[model samples]
Target: PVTDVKHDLDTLTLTITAEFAAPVTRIWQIYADPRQLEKVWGPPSHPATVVDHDLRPGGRVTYFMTGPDGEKYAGYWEITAVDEPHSFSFLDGFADEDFNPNTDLPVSTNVYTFTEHDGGTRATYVGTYASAEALQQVLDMGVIEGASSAINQIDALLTATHH
Candidate 1:
């Protein structure tokens, strides 16, 4: 289970911290590898397909999620900084099929950190929005539950590979 999920409406920030029963390297690989990332990027019902993944400064990763009804929602993340197996930050947002950013919706600054703790990895994800309204829009769309379910897949994914 996820350790904690915190939302600050005043700051338009959502932070989720989860503990994984794996080393920091193992947990970090989930975000470093495109195929691995796709396996758990979306909620259980909405599976993600990564078209391209370049986890470097100024690089962009694009992916799309296919909903239960087969509807596709595309997104892209522009990597801002990376510290190898420890942390990375990016500007994340919805995009068109062509990978063009859609300014009509909320775009967030996301920071992900993986650290060793208690013989495992502690992962923290923080998403900061431009405004409270943007935060509310995501909350209204059930992003918290979707994100929690998505992150929860890490343990199972790692376990299956080790066996």
Candidate 2:
């Protein structure tokens, strides 16, 4: 489902673009619901288990991804904006096993947008980092592969339900 993954050094940003064979609302459902998001978020080998979900402005969501070797990876989002079935923005960061924010790492100001296209939906994710090092750090962590692997499964997830 992922079509393009671009990293802009000048802007200190990364953008991932994907198109889903579903309606915008259905696409939004994956974004709106924690359960769906969990399935469509982390790497397959490191599935996410969301502990808390509050998808609104001034809210926070937390989830932990468990690796096959019993390793834990934590992430959290502080929501800044939400427009139903359209877009949302958040400050996203890594957390410790105890769910404490890892301030030593950089945070991303992320914006997710959904648009209608060819009777389907296109989803675009743009994330800004404060420094070039911060941007490169996430790239080195395989964010593109992790995100692509997760999202590529969405077509089946959507089709399975519709059928």
Candidate 3:
């Protein structure tokens, strides 16, 4: 199910959570490794590749995502915070090798929390933007749809590994 877009965009705080039917350890593995992220969150219907990944505070993740229209969108993630096996905060958006100076609205202050639930893991994401207009930009780009697709991909990948 989808969350309230109006509330998420207008509210001061927005939280989006999803539960994967896999253990915390399993989910943690996904976050701990760069390859797993590519398997799940990469662009749909295209071969997105991670060019570089530095998975720690002040580190960065660089990747190129090829869209269905055959356009390649390069992106990078700046790791602002990190807590092994529990959570991490990062900024993900369009960028070049050294981070593009473009006007593309960045997904800044992204906090990812992993919690144990029964035997599976509950992943709670809190993404804060600069303003309603900034949030709207992402919304217009089908961010929720792409996010949900990645979640589905995560679910399927975990199942394949756990089962």
Candidate 4:
């Protein structure tokens, strides 16, 4: 997999586009199934565990990743829209262990799009924050590097699954 990451300070948006060797169907399956998603949802060092996965509008998914030091970082996604095998949008943010939304933290509205490109699949993610400061906060938390590393594992997973 190859990824491009860009940030727009003015709009407080982070955009990532990754090209995968697999087809759109294969890529979509990664998100559709929680078990498959857990394989690459976090950085290699901090593997994710999907605690709940209800993929649908008005549904929610909760997950957590264990950091190198055994610290747990929980996060959740509130699904807002879905178009199977193509795209979806969700409100993503950090949460408590009990899955309560943390209003004090920065949140992002993320839109994921899957498209066919050059005989492969292109996955694009656009994350919009409420303000530039909020975006910077997550950047300081190493979101870019962590997310890139996580996404890079998709191809390996797909290959392992013969997708």
The TM-score values for the models, in the order shown, are 0.90, 0.91, 0.82, 0.90
| Pairs that collide, model 3 | 96-100
Which has the greatest TM-score?
2
Worst 10 residues of 2 by lDDT: 64-73
Q: State the local distance difference test value for candidate 2.
A: 0.85
Between candidates 3 and 4, name the one with more favorable lDDT.
Answer: 4
Predicted structure 4, TM vs. truth: 0.90
lDDT of 2 by residue, 55-146 (tens): 99999999887644546779899999999999999999998877888657768999999999998999999999989887877787667776
CA RMSD of all predictions: 2.4, 2.4, 3.2, 2.5
TM-score of 1: 0.90
Question: Candidates' lDDT values, in order?
Answer: 0.84, 0.85, 0.72, 0.84
Model 1 alpha-carbon drift over 4 Å, by segment: 42-44, 67-70, 160-163
Q: lDDT score of model 3?
A: 0.72
Candidate 2 TM-score versus the reference:
0.91
lDDT tens string, model 3, 1-163? 2223333646533577788888877887776788987877674586667778887999988887654456666778789988878898998777654557455574656888888977877888777877788877766656566567667778888654643
**Model 4 per-residue lDDT tens digits across residues 17-106:** 999988898889889999988888765677789999988999988999765465778899999999989999999999778878765776
The collision pairs in model 4 are none
